[PDB]
């Protein structure tokens, strides 16, 4: 298994090839290789976006937003690594 996959399974979920994560499952960055995507059942505490350095972008920002959780501001979306 890839170096960080078994690690990631407990952290940010399992690790498939692509961001084709089912629901509720979030493409949580990458586990070991960028070639694959980490995917965890993102329901309750899984707002873990900040672990990946989930960014916060204002409604005027043009970023690939929607990581997980709510940012300090209320109209802001947690964005996956700008």
Swiss-Prot record:
Q: Name one GO cellular component term.
A: extracellular space
Effect of altering residue 13 to R? In strain: Huiyang bearded
Gene Ontology BP, a term: defense response to Gram-positive bacterium
Could you tell me where this protein is found in the cell?
Secreted; Cytoplasmic granule
Instruction: List the keywords (alphabetical).
Output: Antibiotic, Antimicrobial, Defensin, Disulfide bond, Secreted, Signal
Q: Which cysteines are joined by disulfide bonds?
A: 8-38, 15-31, 21-39
Q: What is its main location?
A: secreted
Q: Name one GO molecular function term.
A: CCR6 chemokine receptor binding
The entry's note on the tissues where this protein occurs is: Detected in outer membrane of the vitelline layer of the egg (at protein level). Expressed in the liver, gall bladder, kidney, testis, ovary and male and female reproductive tracts. Expressed in the ovarian stroma, but not in the ovarian follicles. No expression is detected in bone marrow.
Protein's job = Has bactericidal activity.
Q: Name the protein family.
A: Belongs to the beta-defensin family.
- Write the protein's name: Gallinacin-11
Task: Look up and give the organism this protein is from.
Answer: Gallus gallus
């Amino acid at each position: 298994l890839p170096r960080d996959t078994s690690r990631c399974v407990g952290y940010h979920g399992y690790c498939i090839r692509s961001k084709v994560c089912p629901k509720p499952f979030a493409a949580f960055g990458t586990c070991s290789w960028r070639q694959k995507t980490c995917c965890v059942d993102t329901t309750s505490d899984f707002h873990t976006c900040q672990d990946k350095g989930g960014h916060c972008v204002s409604p005027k920002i043009r970023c690939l937003e929607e990581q997980l959780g709510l940012c300090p501001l209320k109209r802001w979306t947690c964005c996956k690594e700008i």
